[PDB]
Structure formats: C-alpha cells, structure tokens
Ligand binder design. Structure first.
Ligand SMILES: Nc1ncnc2c1ncn2[C@@H]1O[C@H](COP(=O)(O)OP(=O)(O)OP(=O)(O)O)[C@@H](O)[C@H]1O
Ligand SMILES: Nc1ncnc2c1ncn2[C@@H]1O[C@H](COP(=O)(O)OP(=O)(O)OP(=O)(O)O)[C@@H](O)[C@H]1O
Ligand SMILES: N[C@@H](Cc1ccc(Br)s1)C(=O)O
Ligand SMILES: N[C@@H](Cc1ccc(Br)s1)C(=O)O
Ligand SMILES: [Mg+2]
Ligand SMILES: [Mg+2]
Ligand SMILES: [Mg+2]
Ligand SMILES: [Mg+2]
Lengths: 258, 258
C-alpha cells in the first residue's frame, strides 16, 4: 500500500538530490537506493577519495592565499575571558551558546578573538594593509537543527588599514562566491549579510567599531564570517545541513548506514 | 655585563635554529633578532602565505589520497561512551586526560573511535581492502610541556582486510616519513613505535586486537597514529613543540611578540 512516514524518512536518508509515487513497495525502493548509494561511495573510493568538507577548505584556502591573505591556524580551545571581551555578557543570545571547558576555557563560537589578537601583533611586523584569514571548527549550542550545527566550520577573513571600504569588501565576497559557484545577494559600523534565499551564508562588517579598542585595534578594517557547511549545503543542494557536517552518519552527503 | 636568565629566555623566544657569547649587550642582541624575525614574517607574507600546520596537513592528505586511502572528516566533539568503549576505564592514564564537555560529551583524545565506526559502516559498501585516514585536532590534559600539547593535531590511517601485515605497515610508514624528509627508527597484537631519538612520532598497531569486537570489527587491520606538531618540530628543528602548535604566540615557529 502507501508508504508510512517512517519508511519515507528512511528513503529520504538514502535519497540524493539528483535521484529520480508509483506502484513500487518499500523493499524495492529501498533496495534500489541502497544500490545507488553504495556505487556512489565506490566511485569516490576509486577516483578522488577527498572529503567535501576538507576539499572546500583547501579550495577556499587557495583562494585567499592567492589574493594576499595570510593563512592562520589559531587555538580552537580559547580562554573564557575572550568571550567577555567580545562583548558577550549574560544578556546576549550567544552567552547561552558557549560550550565551556574546565573553569577558564571554552570552545570558540567564532574566529574573531584569535584574529583580533593576530591583527594587533602582526601590525608591528607587516606592511599596510594587513590581510589574514582562518578556517576551522567552531562551536555553538543551537536549538535549531535544519540550518544549524553545534559543531561547524567557519571561514573568517580580515583586511586592516588601507582600502578597507564597503565596495572592496563586497568585491571580495562577490569574487569569492562566484569562484565557488554559489548564488547570493548582499543585504545592507556597516553590518552586511550574505544571503542565499532565507539562508544566511555570511555576516560581514565594515569597521572600525567601538569594540576594536578592547583588543588594541586602532585602524579601519573589513571582514566576513562564512559557514562552510552552509556553503556545501547550497552548492550540493543538500536539504539538511547535517549532510555537510563532520559526521559518522554522512560521507560527502551520502548516508553511511547502508 | 653577562645576560640574566630572563634576558636569555627572551632572546631564545626570538631565536630561530638557523641563527648564528660576545661583547654584545641585550638591547643590541634583541634589536637584531627582532629585525630578523620581522623580515621572516614579511617574506612569508610576500611569498607563500601558508601556515606550516595547515600546509603539512595538505601534504599528508595528498600522500594518503594518492596511495588509496579515503579522507575522513569526523566529529571532534564525541560521545563520552566512546571513551569507555575504547577500554579507557578509571585506572588508565588516559582516563584523567579527558576534556569533558557537558554530561555526555568530550573532546576526542584520539581518532580511533570515529575511525572504528567508519570501518564497520564502509565494509558494507566498499571492496577489500578498506583504506581510510583522518587528520584533525585532538585533546589531552598533559602534565608535560616540552613534547606535549593539550591541543594537538593527529594523523591516523588504517587499512582493513587484505594485506594487513607488519611488513606492509612498516612500508607505508617508511614511504611516508621519507616523503616528508624526517629521520626515524621503528621499535618493535603487534604494537610498534616510530621514534626520532627519544621522541615518539607514532604508535602503530597490527590487528586484530580483542577490542575490535566492541566496535563490530571482525577483520585483520594495520594502523598508525602520528602527531603533526611533533612531525613539524623534528622537520623544523624546533626546540619546543609550542612553536608548532595552533598558537597566538608563534606563527610558523616565529614569535609573534615583536
Ligand atoms: N550553528 C551554526 N551552524 C552552521 N553555521 C553557522 C552556525 N552559526 C553560525 N554559522 C555560520 O557562521 C557565519 C557567521 O557567524 P554569525 O555569528 O555571523 O552567524 P549567526 O547570525 O549567529 O547565524 P544564524 O543567525 O543563522 O544562527 C554565519 O553566516 C553562518 O553561516
Ligand atoms: N599531548 C600530545 N601532544 C602532541 N602530540 C601527541 C600528544 N599525545 C599524543 N601525541 C601524538 O599522537 C601519537 C599517537 O598517540 P599515542 O596515544 O600513540 O601517543 P602517547 O604514547 O600517548 O604519547 P606520549 O607517550 O609521548 O605522551 C603519538 O605518537 C604522538 O606523536
Ligand atoms: N563574524 C566572523 C568574521 C569576523 C568579523 C570580524 C572579525 Br575581527 S572576524 C567571526 O566572528 O569570526
Ligand atoms: N593510535 C591512533 C591510530 C589508530 C590506531 C588504531 C586505530 Br582504529 S586508529 C588513534 O588512536 O587514532
Ligand atoms: Mg546564532
Ligand atoms: Mg550573523
Ligand atoms: Mg600520553
Ligand atoms: Mg603511544
């Protein structure tokens, strides 16, 4: 007869966006999809062997290195006071989203504090302007689950000093997303948002902002933070963001429970 | 007069292994080193712009992808029961080294549990033998600090099924380290150790071991776990491992406090 809701959920797991009601029973539909998914994993294993999340990180890395940005690898486990100094006190939404570790540490919910410190230190060593970026894990306790992950990967890039303009910031964003092949629209110190439909890809800022002084920053700057899993979701037409996460349930958006 | 211990520590920070007592005061020696380090950072920023830790990860990644290993990106924040199922009860050294998060989670001290699960799931989809690997952050509370980091990066590779022999395992290790240009010696189920002097680069294992059954593994296997920061330390002749870590104090083994 008709498919139960549980059967439909089971098939949805095995379903890729590329796949194409009938007089066909669950057993057959499931067996067909199981076959298709196994071949997909076999093809990856025979040919490229690269994880989508790792591969995107390498592509994004090459992009910013080529455009003059220095690659940063900063701590993921950061001091808890970095949170307070970011202006995240107990009345903010983010205050309740912090994964605390021990008494004095936590998991970074963003790349800003570490990059802030790098900007200050590199100013004493590097010529104007100063262009840096980081790609790495970030952690937020989230109530949602359709566009949100508690463990996700963020890309943040910053330029400091000369040429820190709204137009320049939009140009970098535009070149970047056109390079990846991801459609977007920008929605407008100056705080921007990069949208794909009703999905937020990025939040860009045109400094200076009054927060800079706490970190010893006294120059103009432009910056943006992207989520790699959201980028993957859009690029690969994944219906749920969990298909793009670090996961034991999905490899390259393919179910591992076959 | 003579340099104080504090002055010597300060200069040691500014010192690279390549640099070469005299009638020279601290102010001058420090000013010289500050000059040399700034130029190093300027050279990186003008030329390559790549972080040593990220770059090594990409090189290691290319190595194993080319030799038939599938790239894994699994969760860093893992269920706490994975620790108990690894055979780490409250009488082991590792039990006291776990960074717990919330009631039911922790930071992975190793890549084994996630890779164990991937081995089981991929067996139902992939032809013999099954070759996978992962590179990512790992966390252990450590009392030492000269060869140990609390936040470090691990490389683990595994082959399952055919050809899982001591000789084959040693061949992969040998090809790998000769590719990187890192001198070593192997010290001998079968548990191996890859040493650089008195520094442990890796611990390799030739399965099966009785632990496999808890993870639903019933085949022969070979595997090894490397620390990327230790690899960097040896390769770059860093005297302390903190020069190779995710850090706000060092970029590519160069002090950021100039
Ligand atoms: N929980 C999450 N899962 C996946 N990606 C995220 C998450 N939180 C933030 N991001 C990504 O990081 C980028 C920058 O972080 P930011 O603080 O700007 O987002 P946010 O407004 O908190 O996200 P949202 O409003 O969608 O929860 C976002 O554009 C988004 O792509
Ligand atoms: N705290 C740490 N800092 C840096 N690297 C580490 C650390 N712990 C383990 N590693 C690396 O991971 C590899 C595999 O982990 P393993 O559990 O085998 O090491 P270990 O015996 O606990 O290390 P050690 O005896 O030196 O503390 C090691 O060969 C080492 O290079
Ligand atoms: N919002 C992202 C990107 C950045 C904005 C400002 C700086 Br400084 S980094 C983040 O917090 O990482
Ligand atoms: N010791 C390292 C490498 C591995 C050994 C066995 C497996 Br399964 S992975 C680790 O625990 O990741
Ligand atoms: Mg949010
Ligand atoms: Mg935002
Ligand atoms: Mg140890
Ligand atoms: Mg060991």
């Amino acid at each position: 007869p008709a498919l139960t809701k549980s059967q439909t959920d089971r098939l949805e797991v095995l379903l890729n966006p590329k796949d194409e009601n009938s007089g066909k029973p669950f057993r057959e539909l499931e067996s067909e999809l199981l076959s298709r998914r196994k071949k997909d994993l076999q093809q990856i294993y025979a040919e490229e062997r690269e994880n989508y999340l790792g591969k995107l990180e390498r592509e994004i890395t090459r992009f910013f290195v080529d455009r003059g940005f220095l690659e940063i690898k900063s701590p993921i486990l950061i001091p808890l006071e970095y949170i307070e100094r970011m202006g995240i006190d107990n009345d903010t939404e983010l205050s309740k989203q912090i994964f605390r570790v021990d008494k004095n540490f936590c998991l970074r919910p963003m790349l800003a504090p570490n990059l802030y410190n790098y900007l200050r230190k590199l100013d004493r060593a590097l010529p104007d302007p100063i262009k840096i970026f980081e790609i790495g894990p970030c952690y937020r306790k989230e109530s949602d689950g359709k566009e949100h992950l508690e463990e996700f990967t963020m890309l943040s890039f910053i330029q400091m000093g000369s040429g820190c303009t709204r137009e320049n910031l939009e140009s970098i964003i535009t070149d970047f997303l056109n390079h990846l092949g991801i459609d977007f629209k920008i929605v407008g110190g100056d705080t921007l948002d990069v949208m794909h439909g009703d999905l937020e890809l990025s939040s860009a800022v045109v400094g200076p902002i009054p927060l800079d002084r706490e970190w010893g920053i006294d120059k103009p700057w432009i910056g943006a933070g992207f989520g790699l899993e959201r980028l993957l979701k859009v690029k690969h037409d994944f219906k749920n963001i969990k298909r793009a996460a670090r996961s034991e349930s999905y490899y390259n958006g393919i179910s591992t429970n076959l």
